[PDB]
Amino acid sequence: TPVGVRSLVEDSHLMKLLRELDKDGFNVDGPLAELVALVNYVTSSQMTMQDLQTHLDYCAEQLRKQTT
Amino acid sequence: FEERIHTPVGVRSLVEDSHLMKLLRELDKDGFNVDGPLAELVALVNYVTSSQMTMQDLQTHLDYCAEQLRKQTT
Amino acid sequence: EEGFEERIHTPVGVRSLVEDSHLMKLLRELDKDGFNVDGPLAELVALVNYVTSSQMTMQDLQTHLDYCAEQLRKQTT
Amino acid sequence: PVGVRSLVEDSHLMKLLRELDKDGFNVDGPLAELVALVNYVTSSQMTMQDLQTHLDYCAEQLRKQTT
Amino acid sequence: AMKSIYDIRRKNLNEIILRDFDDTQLRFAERVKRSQNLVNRWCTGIKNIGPNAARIIEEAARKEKFWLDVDHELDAVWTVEKQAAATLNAWMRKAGIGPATVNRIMKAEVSTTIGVLSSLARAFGHEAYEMIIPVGAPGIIDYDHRMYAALPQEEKNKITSFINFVFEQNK
Amino acid sequence: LDVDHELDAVWTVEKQAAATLNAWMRKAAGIGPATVNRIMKAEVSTTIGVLSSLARAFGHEAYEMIIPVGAPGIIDYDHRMYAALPQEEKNKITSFINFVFEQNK
Amino acid sequence: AMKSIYDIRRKNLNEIILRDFDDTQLRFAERVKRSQNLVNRWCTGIKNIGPNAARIIEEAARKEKFWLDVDHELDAVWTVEKQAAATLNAWMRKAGIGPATVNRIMKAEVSTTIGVLSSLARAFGHEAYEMIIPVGAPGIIDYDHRMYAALPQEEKNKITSFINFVFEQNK
Amino acid sequence: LDVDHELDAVWTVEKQAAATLNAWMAGIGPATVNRIMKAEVSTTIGVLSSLARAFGHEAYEMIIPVGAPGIIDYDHRMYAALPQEEKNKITSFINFVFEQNK
């Protein structure tokens, strides 16, 4: 569910796994960079969708008045 | 009446039969050529039919777009 | 010569009807000769205003749909 | 956008997680998450593309009414 | 595309002949005093209904002036077997054959099997489900199949998905 | 493969009748005849009169079971549900299709 | 809902006043032969403009009948110191002299420092920027400030991002 | 803190002129101007005005604050230049955003 995916933004199990592995001495910054992109994408993509929501709501409100 | 006709219900009411469509049809009877006048009313009424349909059509697509965005959000 | 109604099919023609159509010309001098055409005059007021108004909403939506698709572009392109 | 879509099918993390699974360490939690995040990229992109089609339709109808 | 006047005129011409003259172009040809071919060309759309005909049509159709020019869209609201041969008969019209299998004439007042119809139909080249229904309202055959076939699958889903959505918003 | 993704980079009439009827469950058809309700195996060729009653029972009609829905140029939609639509909504479906056709050259 | 007739008449009346009879509504009051108190309550929106007054206004405006009811939008589509003084003058209409915290208050000549300007403005529960606003407020965006402050930050960003896009599409 | 965290959300006049001019990247006197950017002095409204035009902007723009109420944060120069019909789109949208709460 999307509620789950939004919660994957901050401190996922993948996040908790990747951090302790970096402390051991092997460079996981390549992998760590990838999770950053996706997690930011979740945030950003969800920000845009809600922005569209408001604007379609607005468009539908103007249409309602002219037709009803 | 004046508020009625200014409601969308009222502007749609003018499509089929309005006093102006009654009025213009009487003037034509006497030999006055209302080609110019009558061709405009028809256009005005046809824009009312046409734009109301488009708006209803856009209404359908926006609720489709909103339907999908819910599922991605919800 | 070229026709009358071919221009009036276009929205450029319908918008031009907003102020001073031949129908506007017609009803006003008819009023000046003593018959009450306020009813008819009012009907043309509603339609012409609707043209203005509906055209205004559509451009407004034009702007908002451009906005929505500008944001969509970024996320998918 | 191209980069995040590329993560879908072939990513270092998906290779990484598939190497850790063989050891005996159960990565069901971490692996289930990646799949979802990845699936969200396919899903959200198809929807956005879908919305792109309908806004362009809506824009088309308005142009005809306005032009 | 958004309607020209010819569209509305013809649409109104079409509805008149149905609702006043029984959807037969000759009965209106008789009242309007014009050739049934010209009438057919207007109805089919092959010829744009002129301004003058539109007035003559209104006279002939007993309609008030410019009614034909006005869009009235907001105005308010048989056997399988014999049609299988009626289709086949109309499809014969282009002998008793029947080049592949068959030898059923066919009378078509008896129920035939879908295999025989399928074998009959592809003789003409057409499918077996055509033309099973007279109303035709149940289906969009308007679209060119080639154009739909050519669409990437991704574009099909959009088409089908919007259809399904329209279905649920009504009933 | 628990990973749902739609992109990497960038037959005869009797079997269709059996398939379409297999789809109309989830949504005992005798009622009428109980003989036919083994058609699912596609071993028999039903007559059009009986298939019509094996459609008209559902409120659907005969042809809907025998349309080659799998064909690329045949849209998969419920034909009975499209019949009942107002012309306004029929036009909306037709209008979007032709738009989508004009896109993609 | 958006644009009733009273609102249209009001806009056309203000247009007439701004266009023809320029600054003062007293000058239309003279030509229309009606109280300037009445002419003022039409313009600002307190009293709506009825059927009879509309034509009277038109008759007084030298326009044709129902022009006032017709929306004409489709066609439609200085010193800082003296301002700070004239603002402080107009703020003295609505504390009264003496205030506190400052003296040397000269109005006409001096170009005060923004700190004092602020101390003068803030003493009236206002801000310094308001004192130095241009003739007409073109960049302002009138709104209720309490309500914008009350919006969630997510709703603020949606408002602000839209404006910028609007700017971009206009340059 | 690398990722966005957006979903989880969360003064004097001379300091504003410091920020808003720093935000704004004859020209009368250089040292006069070189002081203003780190505050340290209070400028006159007459000098405030002529300085603003250098960028195409007005006087009040540089000393206008952005607290919670007045943080409708936009370029005034750009807004002033808009046609009226399009200004209407902004205020219609804003006033709709209000209504979506209560």
UniProtKB/TrEMBL annotation, chain A:
Gene behind the chain: ant
Protein name listed in UniProt: Anti-repressor protein
Organism of provenance: Salmonella phage SPC32H
From TrEMBL, chain D:
Identification of the protein by name: Anti-repressor protein
Species whose genome carries this gene: Salmonella phage SPC32H
Lineage, opening ranks: Viruses, Duplodnaviria, Heunggongvirae, Uroviricota, Caudoviricetes
From TrEMBL, chains E, G:
Alphabetized InterPro entries for the sequence: Cro/C1-type_HTH, Lambda_DNA-bd_dom_sf
SUPFAM superfamilies: lambda repressor-like DNA-binding domains
GO molecular function per UniProt: DNA binding
Name of the protein: Repressor
Organism listed in the record: Salmonella phage SPC32H
